[PDB]
């Protein structure tokens, strides 16, 4: 019966969950963690990553 309101709540929560989940994506870099990139590479290549 109340599918429309719950649907809106679901879309908002799903969008935030997807946006949080996207932080675990390498995006073509060596790691998805910035601290690892800093702890492992020199500034010329860490800047690229």
């Amino acid at each position: 019966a109340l599918g429309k309101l719950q649907d809106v709540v679901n879309h908002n929560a799903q969008a935030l969950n997807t946006l949080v989940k996207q932080l675990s994506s390498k995006f073509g870099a060596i790691s998805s963690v910035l601290n690892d990139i800093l702890s492992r590479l020199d500034p010329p290549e860490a800047e690229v990553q």
Partner: protein, 50 residues
């Protein structure tokens, strides 16, 4: 020995590592500090900084 560079014998050693995906057993010379609880600190556990 008479040949110039480009044909002389070269000794090559390849060091291979793995990054963070297992418990580590080879570490750097950094000294261990004491552990503190319930306080905001910048820690370094086995090369993992946070």
């Amino acid at each position: 020995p008479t040949y110039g560079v480009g044909h002389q014998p070269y000794r090559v050693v390849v060091l291979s590592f793995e990054l963070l995906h297992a418990p580590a057993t080879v570490c750097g010379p950094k000294k261990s500090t004491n552990l503190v609880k319930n306080k905001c600190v910048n820690f370094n556990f086995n090369g993992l900084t946070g």
